[PDB]
Design a protein around this ligand. Structure first.
Ligand SMILES: CCCCCCCCCCCCCCCCCC(=O)OC[C@H](COP(=O)(O)OCCN)OC(=O)CCCCCCCCCCCCCCCCC
Ligand SMILES: CCCCCCCCCCCCCCCCCC(=O)OC[C@H](COP(=O)(O)OCCN)OC(=O)CCCCCCCCCCCCCCCCC
Ligand SMILES: CCCCCCCCCCCCCCCCCC(=O)OC[C@H](COP(=O)(O)OCCN)OC(=O)CCCCCCCCCCCCCCCCC
Ligand SMILES: CCCCCCCCCCCCCCCCCC(=O)OC[C@H](COP(=O)(O)OCCN)OC(=O)CCCCCCCCCCCCCCCCC
Ligand SMILES: CCCCCCCCCCCC(=O)OC[C@H](COP(=O)(O)OCC[N+](C)(C)C)OC(=O)CCCCCCCCCCC
Ligand SMILES: CCCCCCCCCCCC(=O)OC[C@H](COP(=O)(O)OCC[N+](C)(C)C)OC(=O)CCCCCCCCCCC
Ligand SMILES: CCCCCCCCCCCC(=O)OC[C@H](COP(=O)(O)OCC[N+](C)(C)C)OC(=O)CCCCCCCCCCC
Ligand SMILES: CCCCCCCCCCC[C@H](O)CC(=O)SCCNC(=O)CCNC(=O)[C@H](O)C(C)(C)COP(=O)(O)O
Ligand code: SF4
Lengths: 137, 506, 126, 118, 54, 60, 55, 93, 136, 280
């Protein structure tokens, strides 16, 4: 109850954010002071990418993309258990049995991803070997 | 029965190795699961005891003798459908190995069957918006089952986007009704049927109209059906209409309590346009799946005329129509999946590219079917003739009963248009029949060992080796004679339609 | 005649040295390949080529010692050229050389004669 | 408290985005796939504690540990919480976001002066 | 008409946006042709109704 | 071991005519990458200039 | 089937981080030892009579 | 699809050929390259590469020593013209 | 004082031994930063070959102002042992401006610290904001 | 080619395409607009797909990386996170030592060898001292060869501390790096007492050593030996049995003994593969 004190805190952090932005624009010495060689926009050499010194010119695997997609179901499962947390008492045994069913259905989803090895990054593009066999004629 | 064994198949599916023999046998277990569901359902559900309507699960689901029949219809069509993947259709491994590669094909079907059957039974908006998603998602997953294909994936992406828009339209209407009344259960809303904004139920139907592909939303359904593999299009072009046309009928039953004149005109505007587009659309097309996609739009147009009229003759007309069009749709797509073995082979012109997903794609690939397999062609001709409406095939009574309900309620304009669109459509059903037989005698003397079926080795050259599988040929034969010989049992079957009740009582 | 001799296996028990799996049935397979070596000499390499005489001086010696000894350990110890798996490699790659050496005709006269100054280092003759 | 944690997760993935592509965008699919996954384990641990007190109020959670400290019954959770606490903040050993030997300065190789301080 | 004009400049190198905007691309005369026709239809319809009492 | 992009085995060619055709293809390869050399190295000279200099190199 | 430590014994070491906690403790030993650091330029490191420096 | 026809290649081919030192300004299908235009190795390569830059078709090593007329190049482009694959944004939206 | 780990040659061993527990550069507030953006100093230690000199200029030009360069060892100062080599820059001062030269081969770990201290004594003599008031 | 690139089902002969309102050719000049009239399916393996050869992500593990022990432009071509091809670019430190030695005497060429490996000094100059001794046909006396054996070992400890701990540091274990570097400071004291300079000890000259051991050096060398024995133990505490250290290294970079010989590997990366060969 009564969040006026929290509201002022939210305002203060927002105001404090601009102070992080603005303090640099005032404290730093101007370009002419250090070497004057050029502005940030003009100094393309400095205002450029870093590639260990030498100039150069994310197709991520299926698993990494598959782990991210599977986060959406499992996160909705966990975030839908919130109603049971604040009402674990009143729903009594009936809620507890329903709750376990609501997980056992989702365990089958957990079981299914376990067997197919969908999470593993997998290494099929390489690491192949063969046994040398003489072919006498 | 579905829920208990679907989880068993999901766990068992990944435990065994990925082999087309183990996948096919697992597909048969899908057939056994569906068969048991039908026996268990028929055992406990009867038309006599469901006439009143029996609330279930805290009044979330309500089942009566009308929704009960469609559930039995949905299960039976699925049994015939799974025979397409649980058994060989052609026999040649090249074209049949597409049905055995994906293990989760049957699992996704069983996910959709649970969604299909529960959708007509929804009695609350909270469970309506859920059950429509359980069915809708199962369609998008099904359309993308073959992820190596480029067309199948692009079909599902196009299907996902439009289906999500339809879901949002459906969701928005239910929220609007909730905002006016504050109630959720449909039976509670029926008390306030005279004080809610009736068009919000129309906005609800506009969402359901998109999912079944009604004009002006027809554009995507034709594109999607013409692109997905023939094994996929057979299921996504028929099943969603079985479980949504029934839901539309139940909502229309509620709406006719007030008998809003403005609402009929708007829906009649869509019905009138659909017959135009569904008839003139297929005149200039070269693809067989695009033609049947336009045929589906026109036969959805005919059924919606019965639903809009919504009287005691509509139940008789809609129940009979939905059953007969379903078997005929199964019969045609069963034949098109089998007559792919007579295709010629080159040894070029137009550089026509035929992929293993849709071996039969153009209408002119049915040439000389009267020569190659005359009995199959007659089955195809009979199925085509039913859609035309040649009496006494099952198709004729479908239009006869729709016209009775349409004219009984004063839909004189739509009835005359439905007939004209029936005559216009006959042009592009006769084209299929022209392709099959009209050149039989000019090609009676032909030298051709260049068929796909001729690739198989000769096993013994003495024993008689049938060209087609046993099960798939028997389904075509069983469905062909049902359409042709319905005249015998029509009076009794229509009596079975009299007993179907949706709060008629007395 | 279409035959197949297992040179090195691709699975099983390690043999200390990495990437060198234990050969399933080495002893007769060593005897077979050793015998096939002597057949190759009789078809390709001339008599006076001391390379031909040098192959038999140890192929017959080893192959005879393999047959008498029935323990895998005793085959290595008396031959004294490492493991049994390695002994397969030594016999196999030597067999190929008999094919290649005959192709080169390395029994003939010096093909290319060096110039006068080529092999003299800093003026003083080596 | 958990919702504000999610915003900072989304705040970090902005760092390696569209500012060329040398080292920040290499550690942004890597970063995002890390603090997404452990945000599941961190979130579950919090809810299990809140399940024991049946409250989502931190004061109630603190005041309900008078006779017992949840380090005693829930010792595994404290390890799991701390492991997830480390990975969410990207601190080592789970420090492949700014993998110094692999990605120079990681995602902060472009950042300098005030953007680095913040 | 103005709304679709704004879409052309959002992206034009894309064939798809230009393709379907051509379907809905009313001409200059059609912008007067239709409101005149639809307007004249409603005036002529009612005007003949009054004399014919229905 | 896997050799890098645009690699060729070092071979002592024993034909006068084959070397003529090898060179001719090579000169086209430089001209094909004329646009790239400008964009890769950010050269101040346009694409036609590089081809002009490459031609001055090959003519020489 | 040929492992000396039973399944429970290996699981407890695995789940309870036995070696990491030992690794932490040994590091904590060095926290109570005198650092080697000297204070330049107030102190210098050792030099030898053979040191090679400024010509 | 391949929208280039034979005339379209022929019409735009001359403009590139009008941009290089050619003995005669009359060039059609029958016109040669080495003979009519007096082009040697290095001279002819620039024009052949130039048509690669406009017609966007790559000529291989097999045809290198087998090019003798300008009609062949015009007909070659049609047999070897494809539109570059468009990203998911351009294709469907 | 955050230099950049630009160790190139045998001089780089001494630059590590300053961070070692005996000397502990960290006590003085010295934390090496790999990226040029985060590093305000650049201790060029070791031979600067011709093959490296163009790359060295790219690394130097990316340091935001203010920036200092320390040349440690003989190779970085004037060529050192390899002064007469066909592929050795004879003194890095041909490429980047230098603020202090540490002599040695390699300079002892204290010699680098002494070179760091002298440069620190220069930085404390900076008069930029007074220069605006009085010299500008 | 260089800039871009371009079956199971039967090749099916279908000709005579017709619609219900004419033939294929009657409406051919109009069907390009009709996307449902196209005759080129997109799933066909022979369907013409012309895609430019966009090069794979080639990160530069370049000179300005702490992992680099110098200036190494390691051009790594990777798809995703796996390693496809690696082409190290050595030469960024080619000082031309082999060219300079040809113009300097045998005594003046010794200090060049301490600058080859920054950490293993007295072993480097030992191989040139042995080379000259072999040619000179003169043999170092006994006490000379014992000093080279003792400082041969101390150098190996100095080198391996740089090798193992930086390898541990590059993985991420910062602490063992600093524990060992104090020992290097303690070991470099021994170098400075005998030769004068901490690192580059031009001590092992052809024909023995430079100067005799200072008195009491053995006492200080031995005293370090007793204390040093524990230093390995703590190093093995945070590395040897740690599960994170095992995961990072076990099964990483597998080199067969037969294949190690093919590339001419020697040292630890030849006994790591099982070959029990040692030059000593
Ligand atoms: C498979 C065919 C099995 C038909 C079973 C239909 C059925 O039993 O349901 C009857 C139902 C009305 O009956 P009800 O009042 O609900 O309850 C009593 C049940 N006798 O009536 C219905 O609603 C049924 C609606 C669908 C009617 C389908 C008619 C049969 C379809 C043709 C079967 C083809 C046989 C192919 C066999 C292939 C073998 C390889
Ligand atoms: C005696 C018994 C006989 C029974 C049948 C009697 C009625 C038959 C009616 C036929 C009369 C028109 C047909 C012939 C006229 C030619 C039409 C035509 O070709 O298009 C002309 C015009 C564009 O001109 P153009 O494309 O250049 O064609 C030149 C051809 N000389 O393009 C146009 O003008 C097209 C006009 C726009 C289309 C309007 C469509 C509205 C609906 C028309 C009826 C369709 C049925 C609707 C209800 C069923 C479906 C719901
Ligand atoms: C924060 C809250 C606290 C959370 C953590 C709670 C801590 C307590 C954990 C309780 C649950 C752990 C169960 C441990 C008891 C059973 C362990 C066990 O007996 O080992 C499994 C056993 C394997 O048999 P094994 O020991 O390998 O015999 C061959 C030896 N070479 O397999 C067996 O044969 C018996 C398995 C029994 C199955 C029922 C248990
Ligand atoms: C700018 C205003 C936009 C209004 C949009 C209205 C939306 C709903 C339209 C209902 C029909 C849905 C059709 C799908 C959207 C229509 C797309 C469209 O309007 O584009 C125009 C289209 C292409 O025209 P085109 O000549 O090829 O290109 C001109 C370029 N300068 O030309 C067409 O082909 C469109 C016409 C499609 C055919 C519709 C016919 C419906 C039935 C009408 C007759 C009724 C039948 C019964 C009649 C007797 C009973 C009363
Ligand atoms: C909290 C940090 C406290 C310590 C830093 C204080 C430095 C601020 C004073 C200053 O910058 O003084 C020098 C300045 C201007 O001179 P300049 O060299 O162009 O400065 C560049 C600074 N800009 C970016 C503001 C132009 O004078 C003033 O206009 C003082 C107000
Ligand atoms: C495992 C470590 C437990 C721990 O740190 O315990 C610290 C212990 C025991 O406190 P406790 O019984 O765990 O909880 C505290 C319960 N009071 C609040 C009743 C004390 O503190 C001392 O009494 C000292
Ligand atoms: C009921 C019991 C409840 C216990 C709850 C706690 C469980 C914690 C995780 C146990 C499993 C595990 O750490 O596993 C180790 C995993 C996976 O190892 P793996 O892929 O299986 O390889 C091992 C294969 N084996 C079985 C053959 C050996 O990787 C790791 O090294 C993770 C290192 C985590 C370091 C975190 C440091 C934080 C310190 C916090 C205090 C300062
Ligand atoms: C962006 C950086 C760009 C940097 C650009 C860098 C350009 C690199 C220049 C390459 C120079 C190279 O060393 C020498 C070479 O080209 S090998 C040609 C030598 N030739 C012969 O040895 C006899 C055969 N000679 C012929 O075949 C004809 O002379 C000719 C080649 C002209 C065919 O033409 P045709 O007969 O008229
Ligand atoms: S100055 Fe001496 S120690 Fe430093 S890099 Fe050069 S040779 Fe090595």
């Amino acid at each position: 109850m009564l969040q006026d004190l929290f509201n002022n805190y939210v305002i203060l952090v927002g105001i404090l954010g601009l102070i992080f932005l603005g303090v640099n624009y005032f404290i730093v010495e101007s370009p002419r002071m250090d070497e004057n060689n050029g502005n940030i926009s003009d100094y393309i050499e400095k205002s450029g990418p870093f590639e260990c010194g030498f100039s150069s010119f994310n197709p991520i695997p299926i698993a990494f993309i598959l782990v991210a997609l599977l986060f959406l179901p499992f996160d909705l499962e966990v975030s839908s258990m919130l109603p049971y947390i604040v009402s674990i008492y009143s729903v009594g045994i009936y809620g507890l049995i329903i709750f376990i069913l609501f997980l056992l259905i989702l365990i089958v989803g957990f079981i299914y991803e376990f067997n197919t090895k969908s999470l593993s990054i997998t290494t099929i593009l390489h690491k192949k070997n063969k046994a040398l066999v003489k072919n006498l004629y | 029965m579905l829920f208990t064994s679907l989880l068993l198949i999901i766990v068992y599916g990944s435990l065994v190795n990925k082999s087309h023999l183990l996948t096919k046998l697992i597909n048969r277990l899908g057939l056994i699961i569906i068969i048991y569901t039908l026996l268990i359902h028929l055992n406990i559900n009867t038309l006599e005891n469901l006439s009143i309507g029996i609330n279930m699960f805290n009044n979330l689901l309500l089942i009566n003798s009308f929704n009960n029949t469609i559930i039995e219809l949905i299960l039976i069509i699925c049994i015939l459908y799974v025979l397409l993947i649980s058994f060989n259709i052609t026999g040649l491994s090249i074209i049949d190995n597409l049905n055995y590669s994906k293990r989760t094909f049957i699992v996704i079907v069983l996910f959709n069957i649970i969604g299909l059957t529960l959708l007509p039974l929804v009695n609350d908006i909270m469970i309506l918006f859920i059950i429509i998603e359980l069915q809708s998602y199962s369609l998008y997953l099904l359309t993308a089952i073959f992820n190596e294909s480029h067309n199948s994936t692009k079909s599902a992406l196009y299907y996902f986007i439009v289906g999500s828009i339809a879901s949002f339209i459906i969701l928005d209407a239910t929220v609007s009704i909730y905002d006016d009344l504050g109630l959720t259960n449909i039976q509670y809303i029926l008390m306030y049927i005279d004080k809610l904004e009736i068009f919000d139920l129309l906005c609800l139907l506009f969402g359901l109209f998109i999912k079944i592909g009604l004009a002006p939303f027809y554009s995507y359904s034709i594109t999607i059906y013409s692109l997905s593999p023939t094994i996929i299009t057979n299921y996504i072009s028929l099943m969603p209409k079985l479980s949504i046309l029934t839901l539309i009928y139940i909502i229309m039953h509620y709406i006719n309590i007030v008998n809003n004149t403005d609402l009929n005109y708007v829906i009649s505007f869509l019905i009138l346009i659909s017959m135009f587009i569904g008839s003139f659309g297929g005149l200039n097309v070269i693809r067989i799946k695009t033609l049947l996609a336009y045929s589906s739009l026109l036969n959805v147009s005919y059924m919606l005329l019965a639903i809009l009229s919504n009287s005691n003759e509509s139940i008789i007309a809609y129940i009979y129509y939905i059953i007969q069009y379903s078997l005929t749709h199964i019969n045609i797509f069963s034949i098109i999946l089998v007559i792919s073995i007579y295709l010629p082979i080159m040894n070029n012109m137009l550089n026509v590219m035929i992929t293993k997903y849709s071996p039969i794609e153009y209408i002119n690939q049915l040439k000389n079917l009267f020569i190659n397999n005359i009995f199959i062609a007659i089955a195809l001709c009979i199925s085509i003739f039913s859609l035309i409406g040649i009496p006494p095939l099952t198709g004729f009574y479908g239009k006869y009963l729709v016209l009775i309900s349409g004219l009984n309620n004063g839909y004189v304009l739509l009835s005359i248009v439905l007939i004209i669109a029936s005559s216009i459509s006959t042009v592009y059903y006769a084209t299929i029949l022209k392709v099959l037989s009209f050149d039989t005698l000019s090609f009676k003397d032909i030298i051709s060992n260049n068929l796909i079926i001729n690739t198989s080795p000769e096993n013994n050259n003495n024993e008689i080796k049938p060209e087609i599988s046993n099960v798939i040929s028997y389904v075509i034969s069983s469905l062909t004679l049902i359409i042709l010989l319905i005249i015998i049992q029509y009076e009794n079957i229509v009596k079975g339609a009299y007993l179907v009740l949706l709060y008629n009582w007395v | 005649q279409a035959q197949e001799i297992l040179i090195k296996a691709n699975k099983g028990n390690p043999t200390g040295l990495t990437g060198l799996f234990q050969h399933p049935s080495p002893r007769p397979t060593l005897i077979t390949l050793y015998k096939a070596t002597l057949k190759n000499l009789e078809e390709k390499i001339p008599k006076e080529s001391v390379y031909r005489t040098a192959v038999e001086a140890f192929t017959k010696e080893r192959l005879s010692i393999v047959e008498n000894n029935e323990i895998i350990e005793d085959i290595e110890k008396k031959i004294g050229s490492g493991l049994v798996e390695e002994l397969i490699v030594q016999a196999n790659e030597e067999y190929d050389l008999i094919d290649k050496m005959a192709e080169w005709k390395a029994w003939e006269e010096l093909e290319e004669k060096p110039l006068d100054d080529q092999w003299t280092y800093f003026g003083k003759k080596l | 408290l958990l919702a504000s944690g999610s915003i900072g997760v989304f705040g970090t993935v902005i760092v390696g985005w569209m500012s060329n592509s040398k080292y920040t965008v290499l550690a942004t699919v890597r970063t995002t796939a890390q603090l997404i996954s452990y945000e599941l384990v961190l979130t579950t641990v919090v809810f299990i504690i809140a399940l024991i007190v049946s409250s989502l109020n931190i004061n109630v959670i603190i005041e309900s540990q008078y006779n017992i400290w949840y380090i005693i019954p829930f010792f595994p959770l404290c390890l799991i919480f701390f492991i997830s606490a480390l990975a969410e903040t990207a601190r080592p050993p789970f420090d492949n976001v700014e993998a110094e030997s692999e990605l120079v300065s990681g995602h902060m190789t472009e950042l300098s002066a005030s953007p680095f301080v913040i | 008409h103005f709304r679709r004009l704004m879409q052309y400049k959002k992206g034009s190198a894309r064939p798809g946006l230009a393709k379907y905007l051509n379907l809905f691309s009313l001409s200059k005369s059609q912008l007067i042709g239709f409101p005149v026709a639809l307007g004249a239809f409603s005036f002529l319809s009612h005007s003949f109704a009054n004399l014919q009492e229905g | 071991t896997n050799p890098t992009a645009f690699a060729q085995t070092t071979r002592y060619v024993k034909d006068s005519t084959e070397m003529r055709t090898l060179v001719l293809n090579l000169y086209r390869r430089y001209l094909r990458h004329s646009r790239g050399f400008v964009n890769n190295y950010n050269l101040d000279i346009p694409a036609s200039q590089v081809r002009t200099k490459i031609r001055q190199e090959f003519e020489r | 089937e040929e492992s000396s430590e039973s399944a429970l014994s290996k699981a407890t070491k695995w789940y309870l981080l036995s070696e990491i906690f030992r690794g932490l403790y040994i590091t904590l030993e060095m926290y109570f030892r005198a650092p080697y650091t000297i204070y330049y330029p107030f102190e210098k490191g050792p030099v030898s009579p053979r040191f090679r420096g400024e010509h | 699809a391949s929208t280039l026809t034979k005339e379209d290649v022929l019409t735009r081919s001359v403009s590139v050929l009008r941009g290089f030192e050619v003995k005669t300004k009359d060039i059609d299908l029958q016109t040669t390259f080495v003979q009519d235009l007096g082009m040697d190795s290095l001279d002819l390569n620039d024009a052949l590469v130039a048509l690669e830059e406009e017609f966007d078709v790559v000529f291989d090593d097999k045809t290198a020593n087998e090019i003798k007329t300008v009609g062949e190049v015009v007909d070659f482009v049609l047999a070897n013209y494809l539109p570059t694959e468009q990203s998911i944004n351009h294709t469907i939206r | 004082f955050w230099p950049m780990t630009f160790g190139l040659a045998c001089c780089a061993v001494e630059m590590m031994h300053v961070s070692a527990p005996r000397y502990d550069q960290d006590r003085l507030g010295i934390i090496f930063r790999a990226s040029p953006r985060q590093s305000d100093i650049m201790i060029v230690a070791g031979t600067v070959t011709n093959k490296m000199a163009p790359a060295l200029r790219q690394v130097y030009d990316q340091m935001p102002y203010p920036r200092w360069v320390i040349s440690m060892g003989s190779c970085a100062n004037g060529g050192g042992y390899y002064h007469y080599s066909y592929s050795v820059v004879r003194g890095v001062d041909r490429i980047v401006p230098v603020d202090i030269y540490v002599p040695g081969c390699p300079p002892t770990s204290e010699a680098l610290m002494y070179g760091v201290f002298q440069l620190q004594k220069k930085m404390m003599d900076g008069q930029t904001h007074r220069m605006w008031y009085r010299s500008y | 080619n260089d800039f871009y690139d371009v079956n199971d089902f039967f090749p099916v002969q279908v000709d005579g395409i017709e619609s219900s309102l004419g033939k294929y050719e009657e409406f051919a000049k109009d069907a390009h607009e009709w996307e449902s009239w196209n005759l080129q399916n997109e799933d066909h393996p022979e369907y013409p797909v012309k895609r430019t050869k966009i090069r794979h992500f080639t990160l530069n593990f370049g000179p300005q990386h702490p992992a680099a022990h110098g200036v190494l432009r390691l051009i790594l071509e990777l798809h995703g996170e796996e390693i496809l091809r690696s082409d190290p670019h050595v030469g960024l430190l080619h000082r031309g030592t082999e060219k300079l030695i040809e113009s300097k005497t045998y005594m003046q060429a010794l200090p060049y060898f301490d600058r080859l490996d920054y950490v293993s000094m007295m072993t480097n100059e030992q191989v040139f001292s042995l080379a000259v001794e072999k040619l000179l046909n003169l043999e170092v006396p006994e006490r000379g060869q014992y000093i080279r054996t003792l400082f041969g070992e101390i150098t190996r400890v100095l080198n391996h501390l740089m090798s193992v701990l930086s390898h541990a540091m590059d993985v991420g274990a910062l602490t063992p790096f600093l524990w060992g570097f104090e020992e290097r400071e303690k070991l470099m004291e021994f170098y400075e007492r005998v030769s004068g300079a901490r690192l580059h000890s031009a001590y092992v000259r052809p024909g023995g050593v430079s100067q005799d051991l200072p008195a009491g050096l053995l006492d200080d060398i031995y005293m370090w030996a007793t204390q040093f024995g524990d230093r390995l133990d703590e190093t093995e505490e945070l590395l040897t049995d740690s599960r994170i250290w095992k995961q990072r290294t076990i099964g990483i970079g597998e080199v067969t003994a037969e294949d190690a010989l093919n590339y001419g590997l020697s040292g630890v990366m030849l006994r790591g593969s099982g070959v029990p060969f040692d030059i000593r």
